């Protein structure tokens, strides 16, 4: 008795609404307390309108220790993973991520200090609003960028990659869609490519997209392709696509595998392509396609 | 063992409050009623994401608010940003995109902002809020990787070739290393530029890259430059296979003056 009203004591004195703070097991209250003051400690090591910052993010903030403990998660994680901050805080990153990515995650938690990777994480938010249970969880790829820091720590923001079917962010005039086989051969792309890069969608069909990006970017794209195949979504580095009549445009493309929903085999790649420049060096030609 | 994890819980909470078992749980809450914060989160954004907050009125483009994190991000005094518009802060070819993302929900785009005349690629993520409308957004630097432009600025150039040896791609550096404009190499087989006495040599290596896939072979041979001088040159070549299908996309060469 005397111990329960003190558990509700600290519950309603942790930075949470009375609402959620009411219903917690005390093991949870522990975990949340300990991670909260641990977080404040690291952030003391860092410094020396919350709705705004929190709501303007297309991802969530995680700080994860060297052994995988998620000592902090921003409160908007529910809006992307469905899993609540209260449910994951203090538990192992290794219990909510695709096991095949564990060695990669383990490899990013250790020892420069900048980090950029892709991580499949349990997700219980059905695109619609409704939330489902942990047994019925989907794997969602997260694009994680951040810093390792000291006693090691990883501080990342994890944005989901928008799935090109279900988009509720407007696209502008410098963004065009494209469809690829699994080997990345062109099988569809927007008409705006004509204005943007000069190609007619007619002529790229059947062409390997490996023939239109500047060779100096190969190292990156390949891994992007490989990543896109093993986890199903990628955000590429910026790279140069060869324009039609010489020159190039800077491009950044979100790629995603779409599966046939009848037999479940992977059908293709859908690429959202952000054009980052007007055609540069229009006089130089790089490939035999531009010579014509 | 459940009580064991409970005991470890209380034991290392005690470890982080420097200031018995019934007492420590009531004692602890005194320790942080003394003290998550807006500013803390903002520092996190600067650390994990390198981003700054900013609110602009979305018809004037006039920035109504800038996080001080602008200065760490873009080497930009706050005093600059506040009291200007976003079109001033963005590359003149991104004014179009800007004007479209800013017209009468969520918003997300990429653009090029100035620093303290150099530009950087900024990932802007935010939402439009009423206030007659203002966009509040976060601008994040290096969300991604930059393109390698080391052929724009030497004694090497990379080229792509088909299985036959046709130059299908050559970077801009060739004009400096062999003197030919790109147009004068592409479409022609590499062995057309090779001194006759070395042509089989080159040929043999093209037979082996296309047979020893994953291994880089190197051949040295003489190259006809635009001025017709035989330039000795080593070529390191490997054959580039499609990561999905293994279909051999092309051969990759770095052609280096020797
Ligand atoms: O300039 S490209 O012809 N190479 C592209 N992407 C690419 C090429 C080769 C390997 C992988 C990829 N990606 C990039 C992102 C995921 C898959 C690409 C994508 C859309 C339009 C035009 C082009």
Coordinates of C-alpha atoms and ligand atoms in Angstrom, one line a residue:
Chain A
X1 CA 0.0 0.0 0.0
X2 CA 2.5 2.7 1.2
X3 CA 4.7 1.6 -1.8
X4 CA 2.0 1.9 -4.5
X5 CA 1.0 5.5 -3.8
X6 CA 4.7 6.3 -4.0
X7 CA 4.8 4.5 -7.4
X8 CA 1.9 6.7 -8.5
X9 CA 3.9 9.5 -6.8
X10 CA 6.9 9.2 -9.2
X11 CA 4.5 8.3 -12.1
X12 CA 2.7 11.7 -12.0
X13 CA 6.1 13.4 -11.5
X14 CA 7.8 12.1 -14.6
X15 CA 7.5 14.3 -17.7
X16 CA 4.3 12.5 -18.9
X17 CA 0.6 13.3 -18.8
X18 CA -1.3 12.1 -15.7
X19 CA -3.2 10.0 -18.3
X20 CA -0.3 7.7 -19.4
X21 CA 1.6 8.1 -16.1
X22 CA -1.3 6.5 -14.2
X23 CA -1.4 3.0 -15.6
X24 CA 2.2 1.9 -15.5
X25 CA 3.7 -1.1 -13.8
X26 CA 6.5 -0.1 -11.5
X27 CA 9.2 -1.9 -13.5
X28 CA 8.2 0.5 -16.2
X29 CA 8.3 3.5 -13.9
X30 CA 11.9 2.4 -13.0
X31 CA 13.0 2.1 -16.6
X32 CA 11.5 5.4 -17.5
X33 CA 13.0 7.2 -14.5
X34 CA 16.4 5.8 -15.0
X35 CA 16.4 6.5 -18.7
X36 CA 15.1 10.0 -18.1
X37 CA 17.9 11.0 -15.8
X38 CA 20.5 9.2 -17.9
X39 CA 19.2 11.2 -20.9
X40 CA 19.5 14.4 -18.9
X41 CA 23.1 13.5 -18.0
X42 CA 24.2 13.0 -21.6
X43 CA 22.4 16.3 -22.6
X44 CA 24.2 18.1 -19.9
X45 CA 27.3 16.7 -21.7
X46 CA 25.8 18.2 -24.9
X47 CA 24.7 21.8 -24.1
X48 CA 27.8 22.7 -22.0
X49 CA 8.1 25.4 -28.3
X50 CA 8.4 21.7 -28.0
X51 CA 5.3 21.0 -30.2
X52 CA 7.1 22.9 -33.0
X53 CA 10.3 21.0 -33.2
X54 CA 8.7 17.7 -32.4
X55 CA 5.9 18.2 -35.0
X56 CA 8.1 19.5 -37.8
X57 CA 10.1 16.2 -37.9
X58 CA 9.5 13.5 -40.5
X59 CA 11.2 11.1 -38.0
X60 CA 11.9 10.5 -34.3
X61 CA 14.9 11.0 -32.1
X62 CA 16.6 8.0 -30.5
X63 CA 19.5 7.8 -28.2
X64 CA 20.8 4.3 -27.8
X65 CA 23.7 3.1 -25.7
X66 CA 26.6 0.9 -26.8
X67 CA 24.9 -2.3 -25.6
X68 CA 21.6 -1.4 -27.3
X69 CA 19.6 0.4 -24.6
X70 CA 17.1 2.9 -25.9
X71 CA 17.5 5.4 -23.1
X72 CA 15.6 8.0 -25.0
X73 CA 12.9 8.2 -27.8
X74 CA 11.1 11.3 -28.8
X75 CA 7.4 11.2 -28.2
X76 CA 6.4 11.2 -31.9
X77 CA 7.7 7.7 -32.4
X78 CA 4.2 6.4 -31.9
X79 CA 3.1 8.4 -35.0
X80 CA 5.6 6.4 -37.1
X81 CA 6.2 3.1 -35.5
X82 CA 3.0 2.9 -33.5
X83 CA 5.0 1.5 -30.6
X84 CA 4.8 4.1 -27.8
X85 CA 7.6 5.9 -26.1
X86 CA 6.6 4.2 -22.8
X87 CA 6.7 0.7 -24.3
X88 CA 10.2 0.9 -25.8
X89 CA 12.1 3.2 -23.5
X90 CA 14.9 1.4 -21.7
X91 CA 14.5 -1.8 -23.8
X92 CA 17.0 -3.2 -26.2
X93 CA 17.1 -1.9 -29.8
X94 CA 17.8 -5.5 -30.6
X95 CA 14.3 -6.5 -29.6
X96 CA 12.5 -4.3 -32.1
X97 CA 14.6 -4.5 -35.2
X98 CA 15.1 -7.0 -37.9
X99 CA 17.6 -9.6 -36.7
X100 CA 19.3 -9.5 -40.1
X101 CA 20.3 -5.9 -39.4
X102 CA 21.6 -6.6 -35.9
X103 CA 25.3 -6.9 -36.9
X104 CA 24.9 -3.7 -38.9
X105 CA 23.3 -1.9 -36.0
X106 CA 25.9 -3.4 -33.7
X107 CA 28.5 -2.2 -36.2
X108 CA 27.1 1.4 -36.0
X109 CA 26.9 1.6 -32.2
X110 CA 30.7 1.4 -31.7
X111 CA 33.9 3.4 -31.7
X112 CA 34.9 9.2 -37.2
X113 CA 31.6 9.8 -35.4
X114 CA 29.0 10.4 -38.1
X115 CA 26.5 7.7 -38.9
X116 CA 24.1 7.1 -41.8
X117 CA 22.4 3.7 -42.3
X118 CA 19.1 1.8 -42.8
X119 CA 17.4 -0.2 -40.1
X120 CA 14.2 -2.3 -40.2
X121 CA 12.2 -1.8 -37.0
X122 CA 9.0 -3.3 -35.7
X123 CA 6.0 -1.2 -36.6
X124 CA 2.4 -1.5 -35.4
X125 CA 0.8 1.5 -37.0
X126 CA -1.4 0.6 -39.9
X127 CA -1.2 3.4 -42.5
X128 CA -4.7 4.7 -41.7
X129 CA -4.4 5.5 -38.1
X130 CA -5.3 2.2 -36.4
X131 CA -2.8 0.4 -34.3
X132 CA -2.2 -3.4 -34.1
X133 CA -0.4 -5.6 -31.5
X134 CA 3.2 -6.6 -31.3
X135 CA 2.6 -10.2 -32.6
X136 CA 1.2 -8.6 -35.7
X137 CA 4.0 -6.2 -36.5
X138 CA 5.3 -5.0 -39.9
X139 CA 8.9 -4.3 -40.6
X140 CA 9.5 -0.6 -41.4
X141 CA 12.8 0.6 -42.8
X142 CA 14.1 3.7 -41.0
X143 CA 16.8 6.0 -42.5
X144 CA 19.0 6.7 -39.4
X145 CA 21.4 9.6 -39.3
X146 CA 23.4 10.9 -36.3
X147 CA 26.5 10.9 -34.2
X148 CA 28.2 8.3 -31.9
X149 CA 29.5 10.0 -28.7
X150 CA 30.8 9.6 -25.2
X151 CA 30.4 5.4 -22.2
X152 CA 29.7 5.1 -25.9
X153 CA 26.4 6.5 -27.2
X154 CA 24.4 6.8 -30.5
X155 CA 22.2 9.8 -31.1
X156 CA 20.2 9.4 -34.3
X157 CA 17.2 10.8 -36.0
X158 CA 15.3 8.0 -37.8
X159 CA 13.0 9.1 -40.7
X160 CA 10.7 6.6 -42.4
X161 CA 10.8 6.5 -46.2
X162 CA 7.5 7.6 -47.7
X163 CA 5.9 4.7 -49.5
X164 CA 5.1 6.0 -53.0
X165 CA 1.5 4.7 -52.8
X166 CA 0.5 6.4 -49.6
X167 CA 1.9 10.0 -49.7
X168 CA 0.3 13.0 -48.0
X169 CA 3.1 15.4 -48.7
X170 CA 2.9 17.5 -51.9
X171 CA 5.5 17.1 -54.6
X172 CA 6.8 20.0 -56.6
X173 CA 7.8 20.5 -60.2
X174 CA 11.4 19.2 -59.7
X175 CA 10.3 15.7 -58.6
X176 CA 9.4 12.9 -61.0
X177 CA 8.4 9.2 -60.6
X178 CA 10.0 6.2 -62.2
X179 CA 9.5 2.5 -62.2
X180 CA 12.3 -0.2 -62.4
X181 CA 12.7 -3.9 -62.6
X182 CA 14.6 -5.4 -59.7
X183 CA 17.8 -5.1 -61.7
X184 CA 17.0 -1.4 -62.0
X185 CA 16.2 -1.4 -65.7
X186 CA 13.8 1.4 -66.6
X187 CA 10.2 0.4 -67.2
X188 CA 8.4 3.6 -66.6
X189 CA 9.0 7.2 -65.6
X190 CA 7.2 10.5 -65.5
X191 CA 6.7 12.8 -68.4
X192 CA 8.3 15.6 -66.4
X193 CA 11.7 13.9 -66.9
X194 CA 11.4 15.4 -70.4
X195 CA 11.3 18.9 -69.1
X196 CA 13.6 18.2 -66.2
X197 CA 16.4 16.0 -67.8
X198 CA 15.4 16.1 -71.4
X199 CA 14.5 12.4 -71.9
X200 CA 11.3 11.2 -73.3
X201 CA 9.9 8.3 -71.2
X202 CA 9.8 6.4 -74.5
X203 CA 13.6 5.9 -74.8
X204 CA 14.6 4.9 -71.3
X205 CA 12.3 1.9 -71.2
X206 CA 14.4 -1.2 -71.1
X207 CA 17.6 0.7 -70.3
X208 CA 19.7 -0.1 -67.3
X209 CA 19.7 2.9 -65.0
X210 CA 23.4 2.1 -64.4
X211 CA 24.2 3.7 -67.7
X212 CA 22.8 7.2 -66.9
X213 CA 24.5 8.1 -63.7
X214 CA 27.9 9.6 -63.6
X215 CA 30.5 6.9 -63.1
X216 CA 32.1 8.7 -60.1
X217 CA 28.9 7.8 -58.1
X218 CA 28.9 4.1 -58.8
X219 CA 30.3 3.2 -55.3
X220 CA 27.2 4.7 -53.7
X221 CA 24.4 3.6 -56.0
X222 CA 25.4 0.0 -55.9
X223 CA 25.0 -0.2 -52.2
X224 CA 21.8 1.7 -52.4
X225 CA 20.6 -0.9 -54.8
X226 CA 21.9 -3.7 -52.6
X227 CA 20.3 -2.0 -49.5
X228 CA 17.0 -1.4 -51.4
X229 CA 17.0 -5.2 -52.2
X230 CA 17.6 -6.5 -48.7
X231 CA 15.4 -4.2 -46.7
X232 CA 13.1 -2.9 -49.5
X233 CA 13.5 0.9 -49.2
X234 CA 16.5 3.1 -49.6
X235 CA 17.3 6.8 -49.7
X236 CA 20.2 7.3 -52.1
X237 CA 23.1 9.7 -51.7
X238 CA 23.0 12.7 -54.0
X239 CA 24.3 11.7 -57.4
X240 CA 24.6 13.0 -61.0
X241 CA 22.3 11.7 -63.7
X242 CA 23.5 12.4 -67.3
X243 CA 21.2 14.8 -69.0
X244 CA 19.9 14.1 -72.5
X245 CA 21.9 16.5 -74.6
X246 CA 25.0 16.7 -72.4
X247 CA 25.6 17.8 -68.8
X248 CA 24.0 16.3 -65.7
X249 CA 21.5 17.1 -63.0
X250 CA 21.9 16.4 -59.4
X251 CA 19.4 13.9 -58.1
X252 CA 18.3 12.3 -54.9
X253 CA 16.0 9.3 -55.1
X254 CA 13.9 7.4 -52.6
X255 CA 13.5 3.8 -53.8
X256 CA 11.2 1.2 -52.6
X257 CA 10.4 -2.4 -53.6
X258 CA 6.7 -3.0 -54.3
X259 CA 5.4 -6.5 -53.9
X260 CA 2.6 -8.1 -56.0
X261 CA -0.1 -8.5 -53.3
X262 CA -1.5 -11.7 -55.0
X263 CA 1.5 -14.0 -55.0
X264 CA 3.7 -11.8 -52.8
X265 CA 6.7 -11.8 -55.1
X266 CA 8.6 -8.5 -55.6
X267 CA 7.2 -6.8 -58.7
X268 CA 9.5 -3.8 -59.1
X269 CA 11.2 -0.6 -57.7
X270 CA 9.4 2.7 -57.4
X271 CA 11.7 5.7 -57.4
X272 CA 10.7 9.2 -56.2
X273 CA 13.3 11.4 -57.8
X274 CA 14.1 14.8 -56.4
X275 CA 15.9 17.0 -58.9
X276 CA 18.4 19.2 -57.1
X277 CA 19.7 21.4 -59.9
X278 CA 19.2 22.8 -63.4
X279 CA 21.3 21.0 -65.9
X280 CA 24.9 21.7 -65.3
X281 CA 27.8 21.7 -67.7
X282 CA 25.5 21.4 -70.7
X283 CA 28.5 21.4 -73.1
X284 CA 30.4 18.4 -71.7
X285 CA 29.2 15.0 -72.9
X286 CA 30.0 11.9 -70.8
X287 CA 28.2 9.0 -72.4
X288 CA 27.4 7.7 -75.9
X289 CA 23.7 8.4 -75.3
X290 CA 24.3 12.2 -75.1
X291 CA 26.4 12.4 -78.4
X292 CA 23.3 12.1 -80.6
Chain B
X1 CA 14.5 -13.1 -11.3
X2 CA 11.8 -10.4 -11.8
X3 CA 12.6 -9.1 -8.3
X4 CA 16.3 -9.3 -9.4
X5 CA 15.8 -6.9 -12.3
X6 CA 13.8 -4.7 -9.9
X7 CA 16.7 -4.6 -7.4
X8 CA 19.2 -3.8 -10.2
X9 CA 16.8 -1.0 -11.3
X10 CA 16.8 0.6 -7.8
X11 CA 20.5 0.0 -7.4
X12 CA 21.6 1.9 -10.5
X13 CA 19.0 4.7 -10.0
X14 CA 20.9 5.1 -6.7
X15 CA 24.0 5.1 -8.8
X16 CA 22.9 8.2 -10.8
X17 CA 21.3 10.2 -8.0
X18 CA 24.5 11.2 -6.0
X19 CA 22.4 12.7 -3.1
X20 CA 16.4 3.0 2.8
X21 CA 14.4 1.0 0.2
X22 CA 11.2 2.8 1.0
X23 CA 13.1 6.0 1.4
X24 CA 15.0 6.0 -1.9
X25 CA 11.9 5.9 -4.2
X26 CA 10.3 8.9 -2.5
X27 CA 13.7 10.5 -2.1
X28 CA 14.4 10.2 -5.9
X29 CA 11.5 12.3 -7.1
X30 CA 12.7 15.2 -5.0
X31 CA 15.8 15.0 -7.1
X32 CA 14.1 15.8 -10.4
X33 CA 11.2 17.9 -9.2
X34 CA 14.2 20.1 -8.8
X35 CA 14.5 19.9 -12.6
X36 CA 11.5 16.9 -21.6
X37 CA 12.7 20.4 -22.2
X38 CA 12.3 22.3 -25.5
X39 CA 15.9 23.3 -25.6
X40 CA 17.3 19.9 -24.8
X41 CA 15.4 18.5 -27.7
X42 CA 16.7 21.3 -29.9
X43 CA 20.3 20.4 -29.0
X44 CA 19.5 16.8 -29.9
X45 CA 18.3 18.0 -33.3
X46 CA 21.6 19.8 -33.8
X47 CA 23.5 16.7 -32.7
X48 CA 21.7 13.8 -34.3
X49 CA 20.4 15.6 -37.3
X50 CA 22.2 18.9 -37.7
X51 CA 19.0 20.9 -38.2
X52 CA 17.5 24.2 -37.2
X53 CA 13.9 25.4 -36.7
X54 CA 12.5 28.2 -38.8
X55 CA 9.1 29.7 -39.4
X56 CA 8.4 31.8 -42.6
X57 CA 5.1 33.5 -43.6
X58 CA 4.1 31.6 -46.7
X59 CA 3.2 34.4 -49.1
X60 CA 5.9 37.0 -48.3
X61 CA 8.4 34.3 -47.6
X62 CA 9.5 36.5 -44.7
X63 CA 11.1 34.5 -42.0
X64 CA 9.3 35.2 -38.8
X65 CA 11.5 32.9 -36.6
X66 CA 14.9 31.3 -36.8
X67 CA 16.4 28.9 -34.3
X68 CA 19.8 30.1 -33.2
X69 CA 21.0 26.6 -34.4
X70 CA 21.1 28.4 -37.9
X71 CA 24.6 29.6 -37.0
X72 CA 26.1 26.1 -36.3
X73 CA 24.4 24.8 -39.4
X74 CA 25.0 27.3 -42.1
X75 CA 27.7 29.5 -40.6
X76 CA 25.0 32.1 -40.7
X77 CA 24.3 34.8 -38.1
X78 CA 20.8 34.8 -36.8
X79 CA 20.7 38.5 -37.4
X80 CA 21.0 37.7 -41.1
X81 CA 18.0 35.3 -41.5
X82 CA 15.4 37.0 -39.2
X83 CA 14.4 40.1 -41.1
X84 CA 14.6 38.6 -44.6
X85 CA 12.8 36.2 -46.8
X86 CA 13.5 32.6 -47.7
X87 CA 14.0 33.4 -51.4
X88 CA 17.0 35.4 -50.3
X89 CA 18.5 32.4 -48.5
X90 CA 18.1 29.9 -51.3
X91 CA 19.9 29.4 -54.7
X92 CA 18.1 31.5 -57.4
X93 CA 17.2 28.3 -59.3
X94 CA 15.2 27.0 -56.3
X95 CA 12.8 30.0 -56.1
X96 CA 10.3 28.1 -58.3
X97 CA 10.2 25.0 -56.1
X98 CA 10.1 27.3 -53.1
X99 CA 7.1 29.2 -54.3
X100 CA 5.3 26.0 -54.9
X101 CA 6.0 24.4 -51.6
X102 CA 4.8 27.6 -50.1
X103 CA 1.3 28.1 -51.6
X104 CA -2.1 27.4 -50.1
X105 CA -0.9 19.8 -43.8
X106 CA 2.7 18.6 -44.1
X107 CA 5.5 19.7 -46.4
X108 CA 8.9 18.2 -47.3
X109 CA 11.4 19.2 -49.9
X110 CA 15.1 19.7 -50.7
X111 CA 16.8 22.9 -51.7
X112 CA 20.1 24.8 -51.6
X113 CA 20.7 27.5 -49.0
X114 CA 23.6 29.9 -48.6
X115 CA 26.4 29.8 -46.0
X116 CA 28.7 32.3 -44.5
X117 CA 29.1 32.4 -52.6
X118 CA 28.7 28.7 -51.4
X119 CA 25.5 26.7 -51.2
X120 CA 24.6 23.6 -49.3
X121 CA 21.8 21.0 -49.8
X122 CA 19.2 21.3 -47.1
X123 CA 16.4 18.9 -46.3
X124 CA 13.4 20.8 -45.2
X125 CA 10.7 19.0 -43.3
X126 CA 7.8 20.9 -41.7
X127 CA 4.1 21.8 -41.7
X128 CA 1.9 24.7 -42.5
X129 CA 0.1 26.3 -39.5
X130 CA -2.4 29.1 -39.4
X131 CA -1.1 32.5 -38.3
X132 CA -2.7 34.3 -42.8
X133 CA -0.5 31.2 -43.0
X134 CA 3.0 30.3 -41.9
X135 CA 5.2 27.3 -42.5
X136 CA 7.2 25.9 -39.5
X137 CA 10.0 23.6 -40.6
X138 CA 13.4 22.1 -39.8
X139 CA 16.3 22.4 -42.2
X140 CA 18.7 19.5 -41.9
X141 CA 22.2 19.4 -43.5
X142 CA 23.9 16.3 -44.7
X143 CA 20.8 14.1 -44.5
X144 CA 22.5 12.3 -47.4
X145 CA 25.9 12.0 -49.2
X146 CA 27.3 14.5 -51.8
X147 CA 28.1 13.6 -55.4
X148 CA 31.7 12.9 -56.3
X149 CA 32.7 15.7 -58.7
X150 CA 36.5 15.0 -58.9
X151 CA 36.4 15.2 -62.7
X152 CA 35.2 18.8 -62.5
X153 CA 38.0 21.2 -61.4
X154 CA 45.1 15.5 -63.1
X155 CA 46.6 12.4 -64.8
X156 CA 43.7 9.8 -64.8
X157 CA 40.2 9.4 -66.0
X158 CA 37.6 6.7 -65.6
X159 CA 35.7 5.2 -68.6
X160 CA 33.0 2.7 -69.1
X161 CA 33.1 0.2 -71.9
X162 CA 31.0 -2.6 -73.4
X163 CA 32.3 -6.1 -73.8
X164 CA 33.7 -5.1 -77.2
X165 CA 35.8 -2.3 -75.9
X166 CA 33.7 0.7 -77.0
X167 CA 34.0 3.9 -74.9
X168 CA 30.5 4.2 -73.7
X169 CA 31.4 6.6 -70.9
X170 CA 34.4 8.9 -70.2
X171 CA 34.7 11.6 -67.6
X172 CA 35.7 15.1 -68.3
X173 CA 39.3 14.6 -67.2
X174 CA 40.3 12.8 -70.5
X175 CA 40.6 16.1 -72.4
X176 CA 43.4 16.9 -70.0
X177 CA 45.1 13.5 -70.1
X178 CA 44.9 12.4 -73.7
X179 CA 43.8 15.7 -75.2
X180 CA 40.6 14.4 -76.9
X181 CA 37.3 16.0 -76.5
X182 CA 34.9 13.4 -75.0
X183 CA 33.0 13.2 -78.3
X184 CA 36.2 12.1 -80.0
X185 CA 36.6 9.0 -77.8
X186 CA 33.0 7.7 -77.2
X187 CA 31.8 5.3 -79.8
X188 CA 35.3 4.2 -80.8
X189 CA 36.9 1.1 -79.5
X190 CA 39.7 1.6 -77.0
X191 CA 42.0 -0.5 -79.2
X192 CA 41.7 2.0 -82.0
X193 CA 43.9 4.4 -79.8
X194 CA 46.5 1.7 -78.9
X195 CA 49.8 1.4 -80.6
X196 CA 49.7 -1.6 -82.9
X197 CA 52.5 -3.5 -81.1
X198 CA 50.4 -3.4 -77.9
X199 CA 46.9 -4.1 -79.4
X200 CA 46.8 -7.8 -78.6
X201 CA 48.0 -7.0 -75.0
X202 CA 45.1 -4.7 -74.4
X203 CA 42.8 -7.2 -76.1
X204 CA 43.9 -10.1 -74.0
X205 CA 43.1 -8.1 -70.8
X206 CA 39.7 -7.3 -72.1
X207 CA 39.2 -11.0 -72.5
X208 CA 40.1 -11.7 -68.9
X209 CA 38.2 -8.9 -67.1
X210 CA 35.2 -10.4 -68.8
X211 CA 36.2 -13.8 -67.5
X212 CA 37.8 -13.0 -64.1
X213 CA 34.9 -11.0 -62.7
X214 CA 35.5 -9.3 -59.4
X215 CA 39.3 -9.1 -60.1
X216 CA 40.9 -5.9 -61.3
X217 CA 43.5 -6.5 -64.0
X218 CA 46.0 -3.9 -65.1
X219 CA 47.6 -3.5 -68.5
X220 CA 50.2 -0.9 -69.7
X221 CA 50.1 0.3 -73.3
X222 CA 50.7 3.3 -75.5
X223 CA 47.8 5.7 -76.3
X224 CA 47.3 7.9 -79.3
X225 CA 46.8 11.4 -78.0
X226 CA 45.1 14.2 -80.0
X227 CA 48.6 15.4 -80.9
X228 CA 49.4 11.8 -82.1
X229 CA 52.1 11.2 -79.5
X230 CA 52.2 7.7 -78.0
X231 CA 51.6 8.2 -74.3
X232 CA 52.4 5.2 -72.1
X233 CA 49.4 4.5 -69.8
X234 CA 48.3 1.9 -67.3
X235 CA 44.7 0.8 -67.3
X236 CA 43.1 -0.8 -64.2
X237 CA 39.9 -2.5 -65.2
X238 CA 37.3 -4.6 -63.6
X239 CA 34.0 -5.8 -64.9
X240 CA 30.9 -4.4 -63.2
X241 CA 28.2 -6.9 -62.5
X242 CA 24.6 -6.0 -61.7
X243 CA 24.0 -6.5 -57.9
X244 CA 20.7 -8.1 -58.4
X245 CA 21.1 -10.2 -61.6
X246 CA 24.9 -10.5 -62.1
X247 CA 24.2 -9.3 -65.6
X248 CA 27.5 -7.8 -66.6
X249 CA 26.6 -4.1 -66.9
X250 CA 29.9 -2.9 -68.4
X251 CA 33.7 -2.8 -67.8
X252 CA 35.1 0.0 -65.6
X253 CA 38.5 1.4 -66.4
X254 CA 40.7 4.0 -64.8
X255 CA 43.2 5.1 -67.4
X256 CA 46.3 6.6 -65.8
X257 CA 49.2 8.2 -67.4
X258 CA 52.4 6.5 -66.6
Ligands
LIG1 O1 20.5 8.1 -62.9 S1 19.7 6.8 -63.0 O2 19.7 6.2 -64.3 N1 20.2 5.7 -61.8 C1 19.2 5.7 -60.9 N2 19.2 4.9 -59.7 C2 20.0 3.8 -59.5 C3 20.8 3.4 -60.6 C4 21.6 2.3 -60.5 C5 21.6 1.5 -59.3 C6 20.7 1.9 -58.2 C7 19.9 3.0 -58.3 N3 19.1 3.4 -57.3 C8 19.1 4.7 -56.7 C9 18.2 4.7 -55.5 C10 17.7 3.2 -55.4 C11 18.1 2.5 -56.6 C12 17.9 6.3 -61.2 C13 16.7 6.3 -60.6 C14 15.6 7.0 -61.1 C15 15.8 7.7 -62.3 C16 17.0 7.8 -63.0 C17 18.0 7.1 -62.4

